[PDB]
Amino acid sequence: TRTQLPPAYTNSFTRGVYYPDKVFRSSVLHSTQDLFLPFFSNVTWFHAI
Amino acid sequence: QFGRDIADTTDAVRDPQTLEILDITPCSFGGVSVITPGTNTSNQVAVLYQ
After folding, report:
1. Which of A5, A6, A10, A23 has the fewest beta carbons closer than 10 A?
2. What is the DSSP string of chain A?
3. Residue B2 and residue A22: Cβ atoms within 8 Å?
């Protein structure tokens, strides 16, 4: 057994955005329905120091 | 390997083997017009394109 620290809750700042398709686009807006990370979301922060 | 434009259409496919950027340009577009200056005073016509 060993000691441990309580987990914290951080907040993302517009993260988790990738390319939903392999199509080259330039100067054109595109919207699709795919899995992404919401903006200003609170996730569980795990420490290991 | 694919690419679109403002028209949201596929017209610039990249070759996965050659790795050369090539564009798509079809040659099947336009129409055929006919010019006939009457049928009682003239008999010759002229083909008109678009």
Report:
1. A6
2. -------EE---SS-----SSSEE--S---------PPTT---EE----
3. yes
B6 interaction partners in chain A (CB closer than 8 Å): 27-28
CA gap B38, A9 in Å, rounded:
85
A22 touches chain B (CB under 8 A): yes
d(CA A43, CA A8): 9
Nearest CA in chain B to A31: B8
